[PDB]
Amino acid sequence: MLAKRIIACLDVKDGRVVKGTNFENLRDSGDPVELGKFYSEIGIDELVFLDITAFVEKRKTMLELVEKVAEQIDIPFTVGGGIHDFETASELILRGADKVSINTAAVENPSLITQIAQTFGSQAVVVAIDAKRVDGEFMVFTYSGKKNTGILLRDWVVEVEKRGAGEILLTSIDRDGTKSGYDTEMIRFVRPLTTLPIIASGGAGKMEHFLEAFLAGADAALAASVFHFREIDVRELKEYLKKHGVNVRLEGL
Amino acid sequence: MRIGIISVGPGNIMNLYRGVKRASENFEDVSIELVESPRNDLYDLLFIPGVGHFGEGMRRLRENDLIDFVRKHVEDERYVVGVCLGMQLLFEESEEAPGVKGLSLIEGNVVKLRSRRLPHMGWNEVIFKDTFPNGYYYFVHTYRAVCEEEHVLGTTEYDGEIFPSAVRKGRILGFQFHPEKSSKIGRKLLEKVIECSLSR
């Protein structure tokens, strides 16, 4: 069957890895390209780049990043972060990106999911959904978790599948930056609302959190800091999960 | 050795162009050319990339005069390799575009997969009959080859359904996955394709 995935998230601004890494072995460990190349070598299965440049030059900055990463990367990668319309999505794919992540612009216009998918396929569309518990209900926030859209997460995932989204990136706002584990209750809540693949995101602290999140129904586990600062070895992790029944991709050496 | 890659067909092909470029870094007699038009001739290894509608691509080899230039590569006992849509070409027809005759270099046609979760996307295991390395490669495709258990080279299973991810009819290879999106093993796959092509 299809492999459960481990995915490295690379937060970028101005063509560089926002809060850097700690990988002594590269020269310029803030070069998203060389860090991406590296993550492929130890066995990360996919990369997502999320950019937080300034709105005026954000678009040219991302297009420069995608081009530079496409000439050198031998695995699938996604770009995202302030992608606000079809044009500002078509250009990043044709520039070389394998998938686009859309978030607030998908809440404020479900139509863009179908519009993107219509000329690139659902496979090119990642909808990033950012959720938080509000009065005992999971709700969709936008503007980097600043605005309660008032939309029940449970509704929003059936809409995006409906609109033609290919993959959901599910970030529990409650647990980003916490290193205490993935929001497995939120993963389990979302799992039977959809047959779309779910990337769990937010809260990775140690290997067992990955096992936990896969028992919860995730298809892919996203993480950044734990990898960038060498708290978790990708191969150790994969061998750990292979040991406890998770079907990860683990080649021999 | 000179390797040529049809640079015309739909979808992104420069990802294959590197990665084949990357794979021949270990060879001396090797050179890689983007093939735009039938003029240049001839290559030892010819790649047919592409992703998209079967009709398009059949339409693009076609106006760019490459059906005949491919017809002559297979004949003159040269390695012709179709990857992704390039593999789905090569055959008679697709239900993705009824009518268009394809390349018809291998006997068979093309059907949609029988899974309610499409496209087939992600890392899947590929078992080769011989020669090329076994393990997980990366897939994005909604259509599937139909050929006789003779042109089958590698098999993969998605959502219950077994199907050929690689084909081989003598010196024509086809691969449904993206070897250029498969990290270490994908370079090994492409390196072994190149190693097969020095033996003529």
CSV table of C-alpha atoms in Angstrom, one decimal:
chain,number,residue,atom,x,y,z
A,1,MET,CA,0.0,0.0,0.0
A,2,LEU,CA,0.8,3.8,-0.2
A,3,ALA,CA,3.5,5.0,2.2
A,4,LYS,CA,2.8,7.1,5.3
A,5,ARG,CA,4.8,10.2,4.8
A,6,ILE,CA,7.3,12.4,6.8
A,7,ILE,CA,7.5,16.0,5.6
A,8,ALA,CA,9.8,18.8,6.4
A,9,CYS,CA,8.5,22.3,6.6
A,10,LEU,CA,10.8,25.2,5.7
A,11,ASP,CA,9.7,28.6,6.8
A,12,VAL,CA,11.3,31.2,4.5
A,13,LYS,CA,11.5,34.9,4.2
A,14,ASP,CA,13.5,36.8,1.6
A,15,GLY,CA,14.9,33.6,0.1
A,16,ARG,CA,16.3,32.3,3.4
A,17,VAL,CA,15.2,29.9,6.2
A,18,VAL,CA,13.5,32.2,8.7
A,19,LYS,CA,14.9,30.9,12.0
A,20,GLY,CA,17.8,29.1,10.6
A,21,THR,CA,18.9,25.6,11.1
A,22,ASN,CA,21.8,24.0,13.1
A,23,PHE,CA,23.0,21.5,10.4
A,24,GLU,CA,26.7,22.1,10.7
A,25,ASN,CA,27.4,20.3,7.4
A,26,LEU,CA,26.2,22.6,4.6
A,27,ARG,CA,27.7,26.1,4.6
A,28,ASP,CA,24.8,28.5,4.6
A,29,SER,CA,22.2,26.5,6.5
A,30,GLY,CA,19.6,29.1,5.7
A,31,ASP,CA,19.7,28.3,2.0
A,32,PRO,CA,16.3,26.6,1.6
A,33,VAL,CA,17.7,24.9,-1.5
A,34,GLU,CA,20.7,23.2,0.1
A,35,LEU,CA,18.6,22.3,3.2
A,36,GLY,CA,16.0,20.8,0.9
A,37,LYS,CA,18.6,18.8,-1.0
A,38,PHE,CA,19.9,17.5,2.3
A,39,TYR,CA,16.4,16.5,3.6
A,40,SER,CA,16.0,14.4,0.5
A,41,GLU,CA,19.3,12.6,1.1
A,42,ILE,CA,18.4,11.4,4.6
A,43,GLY,CA,14.9,10.4,3.4
A,44,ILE,CA,12.2,13.1,4.0
A,45,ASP,CA,9.4,12.2,1.5
A,46,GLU,CA,8.2,15.7,0.7
A,47,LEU,CA,8.9,19.3,1.3
A,48,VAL,CA,6.6,22.3,2.0
A,49,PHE,CA,8.0,25.8,1.8
A,50,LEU,CA,6.0,28.5,3.6
A,51,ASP,CA,7.0,32.1,2.9
A,52,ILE,CA,6.4,35.2,5.1
A,53,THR,CA,8.1,37.9,3.1
A,54,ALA,CA,6.5,41.4,2.8
A,55,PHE,CA,3.5,41.7,0.6
A,56,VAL,CA,5.0,44.1,-1.9
A,57,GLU,CA,7.8,41.8,-3.1
A,58,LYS,CA,6.5,38.5,-1.7
A,59,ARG,CA,5.4,37.3,-5.2
A,60,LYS,CA,8.8,37.8,-7.0
A,61,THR,CA,10.5,36.4,-3.9
A,62,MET,CA,8.5,33.2,-4.1
A,63,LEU,CA,9.0,32.8,-7.8
A,64,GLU,CA,12.8,33.1,-7.3
A,65,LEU,CA,12.6,30.4,-4.6
A,66,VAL,CA,10.6,28.0,-6.7
A,67,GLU,CA,12.9,28.3,-9.7
A,68,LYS,CA,16.1,27.8,-7.6
A,69,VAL,CA,14.6,24.8,-5.8
A,70,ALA,CA,13.3,23.1,-9.0
A,71,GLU,CA,16.7,23.0,-10.6
A,72,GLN,CA,18.1,21.0,-7.8
A,73,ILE,CA,15.4,19.0,-5.9
A,74,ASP,CA,14.6,15.4,-6.6
A,75,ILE,CA,11.4,15.0,-4.5
A,76,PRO,CA,7.9,16.6,-4.4
A,77,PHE,CA,7.6,20.0,-2.9
A,78,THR,CA,4.7,22.4,-2.0
A,79,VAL,CA,4.8,26.2,-1.8
A,80,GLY,CA,2.3,28.3,0.2
A,81,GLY,CA,1.9,31.5,2.3
A,82,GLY,CA,-0.1,34.4,1.0
A,83,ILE,CA,-1.1,32.8,-2.3
A,84,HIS,CA,-4.2,34.9,-2.9
A,85,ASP,CA,-5.6,34.2,-6.4
A,86,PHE,CA,-5.4,31.9,-9.4
A,87,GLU,CA,-2.8,33.9,-11.3
A,88,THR,CA,-0.7,34.0,-8.1
A,89,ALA,CA,-0.7,30.2,-8.1
A,90,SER,CA,-0.5,29.3,-11.8
A,91,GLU,CA,2.8,31.1,-12.0
A,92,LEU,CA,4.4,29.2,-9.1
A,93,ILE,CA,3.5,25.8,-10.5
A,94,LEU,CA,4.6,26.6,-14.0
A,95,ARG,CA,7.7,28.1,-12.4
A,96,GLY,CA,8.2,24.6,-11.0
A,97,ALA,CA,6.3,24.0,-7.8
A,98,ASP,CA,4.7,20.6,-7.5
A,99,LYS,CA,1.8,21.9,-5.3
A,100,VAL,CA,0.3,25.1,-4.0
A,101,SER,CA,-0.9,25.6,-0.4
A,102,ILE,CA,-3.9,28.0,-0.2
A,103,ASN,CA,-5.4,29.1,3.2
A,104,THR,CA,-7.2,32.4,3.8
A,105,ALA,CA,-7.9,32.9,0.1
A,106,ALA,CA,-9.6,29.5,0.1
A,107,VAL,CA,-11.9,30.4,3.0
A,108,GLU,CA,-12.7,33.8,1.5
A,109,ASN,CA,-13.1,32.1,-1.9
A,110,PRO,CA,-13.8,28.4,-2.1
A,111,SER,CA,-14.0,28.9,-5.9
A,112,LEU,CA,-10.2,29.1,-6.1
A,113,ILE,CA,-9.7,25.5,-5.1
A,114,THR,CA,-11.7,24.4,-8.1
A,115,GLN,CA,-10.1,27.1,-10.3
A,116,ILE,CA,-6.6,25.8,-9.4
A,117,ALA,CA,-7.5,22.2,-9.7
A,118,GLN,CA,-9.4,22.8,-13.0
A,119,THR,CA,-6.2,23.6,-15.0
A,120,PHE,CA,-3.7,21.7,-12.9
A,121,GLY,CA,-5.6,18.8,-11.3
A,122,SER,CA,-6.7,18.4,-7.7
A,123,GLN,CA,-3.2,17.0,-7.1
A,124,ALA,CA,-1.7,20.5,-7.3
A,125,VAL,CA,-4.0,21.9,-4.6
A,126,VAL,CA,-3.1,21.9,-0.9
A,127,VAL,CA,-5.6,23.6,1.4
A,128,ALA,CA,-4.0,24.6,4.6
A,129,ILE,CA,-6.7,24.7,7.4
A,130,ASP,CA,-5.9,26.3,10.7
A,131,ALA,CA,-8.1,25.2,13.5
A,132,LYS,CA,-8.6,26.1,17.2
A,133,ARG,CA,-11.1,25.1,19.9
A,134,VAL,CA,-13.7,27.8,20.6
A,135,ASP,CA,-16.3,27.1,23.2
A,136,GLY,CA,-15.8,23.3,22.7
A,137,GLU,CA,-16.0,23.5,18.9
A,138,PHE,CA,-13.3,23.2,16.2
A,139,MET,CA,-13.3,26.4,14.2
A,140,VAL,CA,-11.4,27.7,11.1
A,141,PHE,CA,-9.2,30.7,11.7
A,142,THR,CA,-7.6,32.9,9.1
A,143,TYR,CA,-5.0,35.7,9.0
A,144,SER,CA,-2.4,33.5,10.6
A,145,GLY,CA,-4.9,32.4,13.3
A,146,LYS,CA,-6.0,36.0,14.0
A,147,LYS,CA,-9.6,35.8,12.7
A,148,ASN,CA,-12.3,33.3,13.8
A,149,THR,CA,-14.0,32.7,10.5
A,150,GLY,CA,-17.0,31.4,12.4
A,151,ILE,CA,-16.9,28.3,10.2
A,152,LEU,CA,-17.0,24.9,11.8
A,153,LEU,CA,-13.9,22.9,10.8
A,154,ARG,CA,-16.3,19.9,10.3
A,155,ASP,CA,-18.1,21.8,7.5
A,156,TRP,CA,-15.0,23.3,5.9
A,157,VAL,CA,-13.3,20.0,5.2
A,158,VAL,CA,-16.3,18.6,3.2
A,159,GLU,CA,-16.4,21.9,1.3
A,160,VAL,CA,-12.8,21.7,0.3
A,161,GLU,CA,-13.0,18.1,-0.8
A,162,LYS,CA,-16.1,19.2,-2.7
A,163,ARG,CA,-14.3,22.1,-4.3
A,164,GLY,CA,-11.6,19.8,-5.7
A,165,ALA,CA,-8.8,20.1,-3.1
A,166,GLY,CA,-6.2,17.3,-3.3
A,167,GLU,CA,-4.6,17.3,0.1
A,168,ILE,CA,-5.4,18.9,3.4
A,169,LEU,CA,-2.7,20.4,5.7
A,170,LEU,CA,-4.3,20.3,9.2
A,171,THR,CA,-2.6,22.6,11.7
A,172,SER,CA,-3.9,22.6,15.2
A,173,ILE,CA,-3.4,26.2,16.3
A,174,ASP,CA,-3.6,25.0,19.9
A,175,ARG,CA,-0.4,22.9,19.5
A,176,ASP,CA,1.9,24.8,17.1
A,177,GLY,CA,5.2,25.6,18.8
A,178,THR,CA,4.5,23.4,21.8
A,179,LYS,CA,6.6,20.2,21.3
A,180,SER,CA,4.1,18.3,23.4
A,181,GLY,CA,2.5,16.1,20.6
A,182,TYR,CA,0.2,16.4,17.5
A,183,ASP,CA,-3.5,17.3,18.1
A,184,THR,CA,-4.6,13.7,17.7
A,185,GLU,CA,-8.1,14.5,18.9
A,186,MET,CA,-8.4,17.0,16.1
A,187,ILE,CA,-6.9,14.4,13.6
A,188,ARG,CA,-9.3,11.7,14.7
A,189,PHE,CA,-12.2,14.2,14.4
A,190,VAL,CA,-11.3,15.1,10.9
A,191,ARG,CA,-10.3,11.6,9.7
A,192,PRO,CA,-13.8,10.2,8.8
A,193,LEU,CA,-15.1,13.5,7.3
A,194,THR,CA,-12.9,13.0,4.2
A,195,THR,CA,-11.0,10.5,2.1
A,196,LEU,CA,-8.5,13.3,1.2
A,197,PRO,CA,-5.0,12.6,2.5
A,198,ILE,CA,-4.4,14.5,5.8
A,199,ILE,CA,-1.0,16.0,6.7
A,200,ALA,CA,-0.9,16.4,10.5
A,201,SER,CA,0.8,19.6,11.6
A,202,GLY,CA,1.7,21.4,14.8
A,203,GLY,CA,3.3,20.1,18.0
A,204,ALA,CA,6.0,17.6,17.0
A,205,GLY,CA,8.4,17.1,19.9
A,206,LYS,CA,9.7,13.5,19.8
A,207,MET,CA,9.5,10.4,17.6
A,208,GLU,CA,6.6,8.8,19.5
A,209,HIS,CA,4.4,11.8,18.6
A,210,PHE,CA,4.7,10.6,15.0
A,211,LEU,CA,3.4,7.1,15.9
A,212,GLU,CA,0.6,8.8,17.9
A,213,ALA,CA,-0.4,10.9,15.0
A,214,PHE,CA,-0.5,7.9,12.6
A,215,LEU,CA,-2.7,5.9,15.0
A,216,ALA,CA,-4.9,9.0,14.7
A,217,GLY,CA,-5.4,8.6,11.0
A,218,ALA,CA,-2.9,11.0,9.6
A,219,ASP,CA,-1.5,10.2,6.2
A,220,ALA,CA,1.6,12.5,6.5
A,221,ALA,CA,3.3,14.2,9.4
A,222,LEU,CA,4.7,17.7,9.0
A,223,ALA,CA,7.4,19.2,11.2
A,224,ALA,CA,10.1,21.8,11.1
A,225,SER,CA,12.1,22.7,14.2
A,226,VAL,CA,12.5,19.1,15.4
A,227,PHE,CA,14.3,18.4,12.2
A,228,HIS,CA,16.1,21.7,11.6
A,229,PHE,CA,17.9,21.6,15.0
A,230,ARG,CA,18.5,17.8,15.1
A,231,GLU,CA,16.2,16.8,17.9
A,232,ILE,CA,14.9,14.0,15.7
A,233,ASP,CA,16.8,11.9,13.2
A,234,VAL,CA,14.7,11.3,10.1
A,235,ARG,CA,16.0,7.8,9.6
A,236,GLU,CA,15.7,6.9,13.4
A,237,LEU,CA,12.1,8.1,13.2
A,238,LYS,CA,11.3,6.1,10.1
A,239,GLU,CA,12.9,3.0,11.6
A,240,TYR,CA,11.1,3.6,14.8
A,241,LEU,CA,7.7,3.7,13.0
A,242,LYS,CA,8.5,0.8,10.8
A,243,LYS,CA,9.2,-1.2,14.0
A,244,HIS,CA,5.7,-0.3,15.4
A,245,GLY,CA,3.6,-1.1,12.4
A,246,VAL,CA,3.5,2.2,10.5
A,247,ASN,CA,4.0,1.7,6.7
A,248,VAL,CA,6.6,4.3,6.1
A,249,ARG,CA,9.0,4.4,3.1
A,250,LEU,CA,12.3,3.0,4.4
A,251,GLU,CA,14.9,1.9,1.8
A,252,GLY,CA,17.9,-0.2,2.6
A,253,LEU,CA,21.4,1.2,2.6
B,1,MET,CA,26.4,8.5,-26.1
B,2,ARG,CA,24.0,11.3,-26.7
B,3,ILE,CA,20.6,11.2,-24.9
B,4,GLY,CA,17.7,13.2,-26.3
B,5,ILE,CA,14.4,14.3,-24.5
B,6,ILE,CA,11.3,15.4,-26.4
B,7,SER,CA,10.9,18.9,-24.9
B,8,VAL,CA,7.5,19.7,-26.5
B,9,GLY,CA,4.8,17.5,-24.9
B,10,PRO,CA,2.4,18.8,-22.3
B,11,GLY,CA,3.2,19.3,-18.6
B,12,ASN,CA,6.6,19.9,-17.0
B,13,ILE,CA,9.5,18.1,-18.6
B,14,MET,CA,12.5,20.1,-17.3
B,15,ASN,CA,12.3,18.0,-14.1
B,16,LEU,CA,13.1,14.9,-16.1
B,17,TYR,CA,15.8,16.8,-18.1
B,18,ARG,CA,17.7,17.3,-14.9
B,19,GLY,CA,18.0,14.1,-13.2
B,20,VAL,CA,18.7,12.5,-16.5
B,21,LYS,CA,21.4,15.1,-16.6
B,22,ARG,CA,22.1,14.4,-13.0
B,23,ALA,CA,22.3,10.6,-13.7
B,24,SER,CA,24.8,10.9,-16.6
B,25,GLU,CA,27.3,12.8,-14.4
B,26,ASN,CA,29.1,9.4,-14.0
B,27,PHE,CA,29.6,8.8,-17.7
B,28,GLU,CA,32.2,10.2,-20.1
B,29,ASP,CA,30.8,9.5,-23.5
B,30,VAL,CA,27.5,11.2,-22.5
B,31,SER,CA,25.7,14.4,-23.7
B,32,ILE,CA,22.1,15.4,-23.2
B,33,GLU,CA,20.0,17.4,-25.7
B,34,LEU,CA,16.5,18.9,-25.6
B,35,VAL,CA,14.8,17.7,-28.8
B,36,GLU,CA,12.6,20.4,-30.2
B,37,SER,CA,12.0,19.3,-33.8
B,38,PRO,CA,12.9,16.2,-35.9
B,39,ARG,CA,16.0,17.9,-37.4
B,40,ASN,CA,18.8,16.7,-35.1
B,41,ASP,CA,19.5,13.0,-35.5
B,42,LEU,CA,19.9,10.5,-34.0
B,43,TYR,CA,20.2,9.7,-30.3
B,44,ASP,CA,21.1,6.5,-28.6
B,45,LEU,CA,18.6,7.1,-25.8
B,46,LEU,CA,15.5,9.1,-26.5
B,47,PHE,CA,13.1,10.1,-23.7
B,48,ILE,CA,9.4,10.8,-24.2
B,49,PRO,CA,8.3,12.9,-21.2
B,50,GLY,CA,5.0,14.7,-20.6
B,51,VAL,CA,2.0,14.8,-18.3
B,52,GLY,CA,-1.5,15.7,-19.3
B,53,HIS,CA,-4.2,14.7,-21.7
B,54,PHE,CA,-3.4,11.8,-24.0
B,55,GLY,CA,-4.8,13.8,-26.9
B,56,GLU,CA,-2.4,16.7,-26.3
B,57,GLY,CA,1.1,15.4,-26.7
B,58,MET,CA,-0.2,13.1,-29.4
B,59,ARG,CA,-1.1,16.5,-30.9
B,60,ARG,CA,2.3,18.0,-30.0
B,61,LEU,CA,4.7,15.3,-31.2
B,62,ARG,CA,2.6,15.5,-34.2
B,63,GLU,CA,2.8,19.2,-35.3
B,64,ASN,CA,6.4,19.2,-34.3
B,65,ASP,CA,7.2,16.3,-36.6
B,66,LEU,CA,8.3,13.8,-33.9
B,67,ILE,CA,6.1,10.8,-34.5
B,68,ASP,CA,8.3,9.8,-37.5
B,69,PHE,CA,11.5,10.7,-35.6
B,70,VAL,CA,10.4,8.4,-32.8
B,71,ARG,CA,9.2,5.7,-35.3
B,72,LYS,CA,12.8,5.6,-36.5
B,73,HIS,CA,14.5,5.5,-33.1
B,74,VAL,CA,12.7,2.4,-32.1
B,75,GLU,CA,13.4,0.8,-35.5
B,76,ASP,CA,17.2,1.5,-35.6
B,77,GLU,CA,17.5,-0.5,-32.3
B,78,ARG,CA,17.9,2.6,-30.1
B,79,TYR,CA,16.6,2.9,-26.5
B,80,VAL,CA,13.4,4.9,-26.5
B,81,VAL,CA,12.0,5.8,-23.1
B,82,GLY,CA,8.5,7.2,-22.4
B,83,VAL,CA,8.0,8.5,-18.9
B,84,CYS,CA,4.6,9.3,-17.3
B,85,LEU,CA,2.3,10.4,-20.2
B,86,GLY,CA,5.3,9.3,-22.4
B,87,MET,CA,4.6,5.8,-21.2
B,88,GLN,CA,0.8,6.1,-21.8
B,89,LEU,CA,1.6,7.2,-25.3
B,90,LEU,CA,3.6,4.4,-27.0
B,91,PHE,CA,0.4,2.3,-27.0
B,92,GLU,CA,-2.7,2.3,-29.2
B,93,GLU,CA,-5.3,4.5,-27.5
B,94,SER,CA,-6.4,6.1,-24.3
B,95,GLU,CA,-9.9,6.4,-23.0
B,96,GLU,CA,-8.7,9.8,-22.0
B,97,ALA,CA,-9.1,10.9,-25.6
B,98,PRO,CA,-11.0,8.5,-27.9
B,99,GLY,CA,-9.9,8.6,-31.5
B,100,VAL,CA,-6.3,9.6,-31.3
B,101,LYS,CA,-4.1,6.7,-32.5
B,102,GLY,CA,-1.1,7.1,-30.1
B,103,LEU,CA,2.4,5.9,-31.0
B,104,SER,CA,1.4,2.2,-31.0
B,105,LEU,CA,5.0,1.0,-30.3
B,106,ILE,CA,3.7,-1.5,-27.7
B,107,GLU,CA,0.5,-3.5,-28.2
B,108,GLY,CA,-2.1,-2.2,-25.8
B,109,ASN,CA,-4.3,0.7,-24.8
B,110,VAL,CA,-4.9,3.0,-21.9
B,111,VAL,CA,-7.8,3.0,-19.3
B,112,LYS,CA,-8.7,4.9,-16.2
B,113,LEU,CA,-7.9,3.3,-12.9
B,114,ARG,CA,-10.7,1.7,-10.9
B,115,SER,CA,-10.3,3.6,-7.6
B,116,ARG,CA,-12.6,6.2,-6.1
B,117,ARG,CA,-9.6,8.1,-4.6
B,118,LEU,CA,-7.9,9.6,-7.7
B,119,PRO,CA,-5.3,10.5,-8.8
B,120,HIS,CA,-3.0,7.8,-7.6
B,121,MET,CA,-0.6,10.1,-5.7
B,122,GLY,CA,2.4,9.4,-3.4
B,123,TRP,CA,5.0,6.8,-2.7
B,124,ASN,CA,4.3,3.3,-3.8
B,125,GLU,CA,6.3,0.1,-3.9
B,126,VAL,CA,7.4,-1.1,-7.4
B,127,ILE,CA,8.5,-4.7,-8.0
B,128,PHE,CA,10.7,-5.2,-11.1
B,129,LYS,CA,11.0,-8.5,-12.9
B,130,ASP,CA,14.7,-7.8,-13.4
B,131,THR,CA,17.4,-5.1,-13.8
B,132,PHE,CA,16.0,-2.1,-12.2
B,133,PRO,CA,16.0,-1.6,-8.4
B,134,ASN,CA,13.0,-2.5,-6.2
B,135,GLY,CA,11.4,-0.1,-3.8
B,136,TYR,CA,9.2,3.0,-3.4
B,137,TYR,CA,8.9,5.5,-6.2
B,138,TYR,CA,6.6,8.5,-6.5
B,139,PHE,CA,3.3,8.5,-8.6
B,140,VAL,CA,0.8,11.1,-9.9
B,141,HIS,CA,-1.4,9.6,-12.6
B,142,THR,CA,-5.1,9.0,-13.3
B,143,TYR,CA,-4.6,6.6,-16.2
B,144,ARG,CA,-3.1,3.1,-16.5
B,145,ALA,CA,-1.5,0.9,-19.1
B,146,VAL,CA,-3.2,-2.2,-20.6
B,147,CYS,CA,-0.6,-4.6,-22.1
B,148,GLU,CA,0.1,-8.3,-22.2
B,149,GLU,CA,2.1,-10.0,-19.4
B,150,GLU,CA,5.2,-9.8,-21.6
B,151,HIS,CA,5.6,-6.1,-22.1
B,152,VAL,CA,5.1,-5.8,-18.3
B,153,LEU,CA,8.4,-4.8,-16.6
B,154,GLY,CA,7.4,-3.5,-13.2
B,155,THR,CA,4.1,-3.8,-11.2
B,156,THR,CA,2.5,-1.6,-8.5
B,157,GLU,CA,-0.7,-1.9,-6.5
B,158,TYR,CA,-3.0,1.1,-5.6
B,159,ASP,CA,-6.3,0.6,-3.7
B,160,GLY,CA,-6.5,-3.1,-4.4
B,161,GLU,CA,-5.6,-2.8,-8.2
B,162,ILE,CA,-2.4,-4.3,-9.5
B,163,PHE,CA,-1.0,-2.6,-12.6
B,164,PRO,CA,2.3,-2.2,-14.6
B,165,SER,CA,4.3,0.8,-13.5
B,166,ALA,CA,7.1,-0.1,-15.9
B,167,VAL,CA,6.9,-1.6,-19.4
B,168,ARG,CA,9.6,-3.1,-21.6
B,169,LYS,CA,9.3,-4.2,-25.2
B,170,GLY,CA,12.9,-5.0,-26.1
B,171,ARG,CA,14.6,-1.5,-26.2
B,172,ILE,CA,11.4,0.5,-25.5
B,173,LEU,CA,11.0,1.2,-21.8
B,174,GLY,CA,8.1,2.9,-20.1
B,175,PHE,CA,7.7,4.1,-16.5
B,176,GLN,CA,4.5,5.4,-15.1
B,177,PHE,CA,6.0,7.0,-11.9
B,178,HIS,CA,8.3,10.1,-11.8
B,179,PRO,CA,11.8,8.7,-11.4
B,180,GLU,CA,12.9,12.4,-11.2
B,181,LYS,CA,10.8,12.7,-8.0
B,182,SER,CA,12.0,9.6,-6.2
B,183,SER,CA,15.1,10.7,-4.3
B,184,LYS,CA,18.0,8.2,-4.2
B,185,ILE,CA,16.3,5.2,-5.9
B,186,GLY,CA,15.1,7.4,-8.7
B,187,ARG,CA,18.6,8.3,-9.7
B,188,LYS,CA,19.5,4.6,-9.5
B,189,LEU,CA,16.6,3.8,-11.8
B,190,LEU,CA,17.7,6.4,-14.3
B,191,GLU,CA,21.4,5.4,-14.0
B,192,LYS,CA,20.5,1.8,-14.8
B,193,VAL,CA,18.5,3.0,-17.8
B,194,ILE,CA,21.7,4.7,-19.0
B,195,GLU,CA,23.7,1.6,-18.3
B,196,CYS,CA,21.3,-0.5,-20.4
B,197,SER,CA,21.8,1.9,-23.3
B,198,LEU,CA,25.6,1.4,-23.7
B,199,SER,CA,25.0,-2.2,-24.7
B,200,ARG,CA,24.1,-2.1,-28.4
